[PDB]
Structure formats: structure tokens, C-alpha cells
């Protein structure tokens with residue numbers, strides 16, 4: 001009934017994939033109890049850094065990537081949820097279920113990737129465990145893993161980036177193409193779609 005209807009919580013930044021140095025590693029910035037509280041209030045005063053965030057809802061965890069001043073992720077993780085911020089919940093500025101894409105204004109302190117203009121097909125996928133996986137681009141929205149992996153290895157990495165050799169954003173990881181539980185290829189949202197959305 002009306003008076004007791006609940007609201008979904010906010011997406012919460014719980015960590016980041018550190019790519020700044022010579023070693024890529026995942027960093028946690030908030031534990032599970034703090035995550036749950038922050039999702040409910042939508043108020044997150046933690047400092048944000050970096051290009052790739054680890055994000056969570058009450059039920060899922062995935063990645064989000066800043067490109068051109070927007071923190072982008074997948075709709076199948078975020079839905080229409082707000083993101084927690086120092087001043088309270090922030091509404092999505094982009095939502096496109098057809099592309100599986102959402103975005104919010106990038107948090108203060110984040111750094112953004114630049115869309116790739118290289119026209120090159122040797123790519124790198126960054127996972128939530130900070131693995132950097134070589135991917136050969138095979139079409140507008142597909143690339144093949146040079147070394148196939150069980151889907152377990154990729155689960156929770158949607159929203160993360162595919163990058164070119166120079167570290168530009170080429171796309172956002174969306175789905176794994178798997179046969180018998182092995183991912184031989186990935187599907188991604190090309191950066192040009194994000195640029196058109198903007």
C-alpha cells in the first residue's frame with residue numbers, strides 16, 4: 001500500500017581500479033556495512049579518485065568508467081538508480097535501456113578517459129580484479145579474447161573499459177560471448193555511442 005512503499009537505494013562507489021602506476025590493482029574504499037548505509041542515504045563523503053570505479057547496489061557489484069566528464073555504467077547493473085554523492089543522491093543524466101547504458105555527472109576527484117580516435121583494433125579490457133586482458137577488435141561492438149577465460153573471471157566487470165594501446169576509451173564492457181561457460185569474446189558499447197548520447 002502507498003504509505004509503506006520502499007525506494008531503491010543508490011549506487012555506491014566502493015573502490016577503484018588503480019591504473020596510475022606500473023601496476024594495476026583493485027582498491028577497496030568502503031566495506032559492506034558502510035556500503036549498505038550509503039546506499040540508503042545516498043550520502044557518500046568519501047574521496048573519489050581515478051578513472052574506473054567499483055560500484056555496488058544492495059544486490060550487485062560491477063564497474064563504472066569516467067569518459068568526458070560522465071561516469072558511465074551498464075543499465076543491467078544500475079537500473080534507473082541515483083548515485084550516492086557528498087550532497088546526497090544524484091539522478092542519472094543519461095539512461096538508455098536499448099544500449100544497456102547509463103551515466104551520471106562524474107564525481108569530483110575522478111579523472112576521465114578520452115575517447116579513442118586511433119582507429120586501431122588492438123584493445124585491452126580492464127576487469128574488477130585489475131586484470132588487463134588483451135582483446136582483438138572484431139566488429140563495431142565485439143572483440144575476441146586472445147586467451148579465453150571462464151565467465152566467472154569476467155562476472156562483475158560490466159561497466160569497465162576497453163582501452164586502446166595509448167589508453168584512450170574504446171568502449172564499455174557489456175556482455176560476454178560464451179560457449180559452455182567459456183568466454184571467447186566480449187560485447188561492448190562503443191565509445192562513439194556514448195559520444196552521440198552526449
Ligand SMILES: CC(C)(C)OC(=O)N[C@H]1CCCCC/C=C\[C@@H]2C[C@@]2(C(=O)NS(=O)(=O)C2CC2)NC(=O)[C@@H]2C[C@@H](OC(=O)n3cc4cccc(F)c4c3)CN2C1=O
Nearest residue numbers: 060062076077098099100151154155156157158174175176
Ligand atoms: C549479448 C549476448 C552476446 C547474447 O551475450 C550475453 O547476453 N551474455 C551474457 C552472459 C552472462 C554470463 C556472465 C558473463 C560474465 C560477465 C558479463 C559482463 C557482464 C557482467 O559482468 N555483468 S555483472 O555481473 O557486472 C552485472 C552486475 C551487473 N554482463 C552480463 O552478465 C550481461 C547481462 C545480460 O545482458 C544484458 O542485460 N544485455 C542488455 C543488452 C542491450 C544491448 C546489447 C546487449 F548485448 C545487451 C546484453 C546477460 N549478460 C551477459 O554477459
Ligand SMILES: [Zn+2]
Nearest residue numbers: 116118164168
Ligand atoms: Zn586511441
